[PDB]
Amino acid sequence: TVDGLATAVRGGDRAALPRAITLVESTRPDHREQAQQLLLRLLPDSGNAHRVGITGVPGVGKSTAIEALGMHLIERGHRVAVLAVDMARLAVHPNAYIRPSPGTLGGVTRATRETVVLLEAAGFDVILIETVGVGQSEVAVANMVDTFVLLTLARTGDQLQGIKKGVLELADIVVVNKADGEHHKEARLAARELSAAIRLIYPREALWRPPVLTMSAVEGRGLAELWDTVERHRQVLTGAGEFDARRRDQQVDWTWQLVRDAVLDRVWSNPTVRKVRSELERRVRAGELTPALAAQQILEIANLTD
Amino acid sequence: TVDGLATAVRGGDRAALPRAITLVESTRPDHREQAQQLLLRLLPDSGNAHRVGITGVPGVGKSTAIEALGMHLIERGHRVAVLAVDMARLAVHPNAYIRPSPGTLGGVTRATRETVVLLEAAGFDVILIETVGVGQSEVAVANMVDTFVLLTLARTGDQLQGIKKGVLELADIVVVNKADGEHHKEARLAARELSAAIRLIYPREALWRPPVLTMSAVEGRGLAELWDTVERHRQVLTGAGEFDARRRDQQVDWTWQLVRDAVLDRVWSNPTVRKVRSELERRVRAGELTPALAAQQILEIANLTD
Numbered sequence: 001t002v003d004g005l006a007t008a009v010r011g012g013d014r015a016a017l018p019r020a021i022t023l024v025e026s027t028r029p030d031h032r033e034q035a036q037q038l039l040l041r042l043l044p045d046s047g048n049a050h051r052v053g054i055t056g057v058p059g060v061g062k063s064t065a066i067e068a069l070g071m072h073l074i075e076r077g078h079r080v081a082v083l084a085v086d087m088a089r090l091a092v093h094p095n096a097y098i099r100p101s102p103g104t105l106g107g108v109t110r111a112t113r114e115t116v117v118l119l120e121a122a123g124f125d126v127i128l129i130e131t132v133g134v135g136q137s138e139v140a141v142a143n144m145v146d147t148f149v150l151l152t153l154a155r156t157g158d159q160l161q162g163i164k165k166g167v168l169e170l171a172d173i174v175v176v177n178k179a180d181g182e183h184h185k186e187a188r189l190a191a192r193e194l195s196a197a198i199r200l201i202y203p204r205e206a207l208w209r210p211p212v213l214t215m216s217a218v219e220g221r222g223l224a225e226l227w228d229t230v231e232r233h234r235q236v237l238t239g240a241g242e243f244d245a246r247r248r249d250q251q252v253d254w255t256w257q258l259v260r261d262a263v264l265d266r267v268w269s270n271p272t273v274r275k276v277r278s279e280l281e282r283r284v285r286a287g288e289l290t291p292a293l294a295a296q297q298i299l300e301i302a303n304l305t306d
Numbered sequence: 307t308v309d310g311l312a313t314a315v316r317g318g319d320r321a322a323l324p325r326a327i328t329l330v331e332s333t334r335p336d337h338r339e340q341a342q343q344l345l346l347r348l349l350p351d352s353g354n355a356h357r358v359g360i361t362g363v364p365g366v367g368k369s370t371a372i373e374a375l376g377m378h379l380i381e382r383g384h385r386v387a388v389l390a391v392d393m394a395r396l397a398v399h400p401n402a403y404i405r406p407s408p409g410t411l412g413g414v415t416r417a418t419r420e421t422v423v424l425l426e427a428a429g430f431d432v433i434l435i436e437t438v439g440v441g442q443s444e445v446a447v448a449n450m451v452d453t454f455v456l457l458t459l460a461r462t463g464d465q466l467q468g469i470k471k472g473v474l475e476l477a478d479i480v481v482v483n484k485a486d487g488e489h490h491k492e493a494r495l496a497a498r499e500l501s502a503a504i505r506l507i508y509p510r511e512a513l514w515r516p517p518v519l520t521m522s523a524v525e526g527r528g529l530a531e532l533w534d535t536v537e538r539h540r541q542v543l544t545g546a547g548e549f550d551a552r553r554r555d556q557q558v559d560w561t562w563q564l565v566r567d568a569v570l571d572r573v574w575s576n577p578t579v580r581k582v583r584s585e586l587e588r589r590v591r592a593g594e595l596t597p598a599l600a601a602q603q604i605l606e607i608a609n610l611t612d
């Protein structure tokens with residue numbers, strides 16, 4: 001039973017956890033309902049953790065950094081979980097848990113958010129959530145974590161190559177990675193350039209202006225200082241009452257997103273609407289039909305076949 | 307009749323236009339339906355214009371710049387309309403039309419977008435759309451124009467004071483205003499700093515990297531060069547086939563936004579949902595209820611009272 005599973009999860013049973021996550025990842029209407037009851041039971045045991053999101057372009061070094069950070073943390077007495085929303089030395093360790101990405105963005109987002117509750121209830125005190133680069137995936141992850149970390153390249157004038165614009169402003173901390181080999185001095189200059197842009201984007205910020213750090217994830221340099229900064233972010237926000245405020249706001253926002261997706265899905269997933277979408281859009285693109293009149297036809301058609 | 311009004315608008319009757327806009331601004335269900343028929347008739351006569359959005363903080367100088375730009379353009383044979391989404395020398399002129407902002411953002415957005423169609427049909431070839439600073443108002447205006455212009459302050463390290471973060475990335479052109487009095491050299495340095503950040507945000511952009519210009523709207527300096535740059539934006543995008551692409555994409559996006567707002571409004575505007583919102587949100591904030599379970603209760607309650 002749900003009541004049994006909850007007891008085994010919070011008591012720390014290593015076999016219960018993956019079964020609980022499996023229940024949460026299921027989109028069968030029977031499973032969703034018990035999942036919701038299980039999460040209700042475990043919600044009071046959650047929240048005692050720091051949730052950190054980590055993003056950056058393919059090949060910037062996210063997996064290398066996460067592995068090195070995960071070991072740094074395990075050696076300091078933390079229990080560390082890694083999730084991906086789309087590391088062999090780490091996976092070995094009993095105080096780590098690593099899980100691959102679970103359909104749509106809404107769906108992977110929901111499954112990830114619910115899995116966080118389970119991990120925290122199971123005693124994990126650090127949750128690292130990696131993007132797979134792009135969807136609206138960066139925003140989704142930023143909205144479920146306490147501290148969002150952007151990794152960039154350590155090259156003057158080229159740090160943000162390949163990043164979706166607007167992602168810089170999501171970051172609580174920015175890191176220039178691969179500050180090694182022929183790019184030690186270059187990395188400092190590249191960090192100073194990003195710092196200059198961050199001062200322009202946050203010119204009179206008084207609580208937290210995102211720091212720009214350098215790192216060599218492959219040589220294991222800069223991970224400790226990155227975590228020191230993640231802790232300082234939490235301390236600063238907590239002293240201002242904003243750490244809890246951010247979480248409460250994210251939960252209310254997610255509630256309304258669930259309401260939105262439920263009501264919009266009826267229209268979007270409607271086979272007949274899917275059939276006529278192309279032609280209705282073509283008519284709009286060609287100025288043969290107004291957006292308002294095309295919207296009305298979409299709604300009428302959904303309603304006739306719902 | 308709608309058929310009569312359309313003939314008078316496209317034939318250039320100055321009395322028909324404000325009546326047509328009045329019909330469009332009405333949210334009475336009878337008016338909305340004729341408005342839609344009128345827009346359908348005039349849609350083929352629209353599109354022959356450059357739509358420019360203009361944003362920046364209160365007091366940066368938007369109204370001063372728009373007045374000076376509007377006169378620059380009128381003197382060059384254009385017919386210029388000014389709309390606001392929330393100038394005495396300009397209002398005097400027969401080849402200008404100025405209209406104050408029309409409920410919600412969705413509502414003002416819809417009325418503004420429809421009014422654009424009417425103005426273009428009436429022979430206006432430049433449409434300037436001013437924000438009133440913030441809502442999600444900047445995004446709304448950027449999504450209905452061809453060229454989005456951000457005005458900022460001409461002070462080194464303080465150009466973006468008061469701007470919602472993420473707004474910089476909406477801009478097709480950035481202008482440092484008030485490059486006058488004691489800030490002539492400072493303005494050049496402030497422009498160079500923004501240019502440096504723009505290079506970092508757009509490091510390998512090949513089609514259009516947003517230029518940063520200086521201006522003194524109050525002394526009438528820099529308006530001509532601002533318009534020269536707006537024309538160059540259109541020429542560059544047109545040569546790449548992106549000018550028409552942007553418009554078609556905005557229209558399809560607006561269509562789906564209308565569908566979204568129709569379906570979400572049923573829930574949001576429901577009196578009973580409004581009544582229980584506070585307590586449901588409090589329960590979510592306190593960890594007494596899951597987002598998914600709160601969403602379900604919101605949907606059930608809407609459905610019971612719909």
Ligand SMILES: Nc1nc2c(ncn2[C@@H]2O[C@H](COP(=O)(O)OP(=O)(O)O)[C@@H](O)[C@H]2O)c(=O)[nH]1
Nearest residue numbers: 057058059060061062063064177178216217218
């Ligand atoms: N020079 C250098 N290479 C790195 C660093 N971190 C990762 N790499 C290399 O970059 C490649 C991609 O790294 P990976 O961690 O898989 O990047 P990911 O795609 O972001 O997860 C691999 O060859 C890594 O060895 C670093 O700090 N310096």
Ligand SMILES: Nc1nc2c(ncn2[C@@H]2O[C@H](COP(=O)(O)OP(=O)(O)O)[C@@H](O)[C@H]2O)c(=O)[nH]1
Nearest residue numbers: 363364365366367368369370483484522523524
């Ligand atoms: N020094 C200087 N003042 C300006 C300039 N443009 C506008 N102003 C002044 O700034 C104040 C606000 O200008 P206004 O155009 O109303 O700004 P708005 O709120 O953005 O529409 C007024 O006192 C203007 O005279 C400029 O280029 N230089």
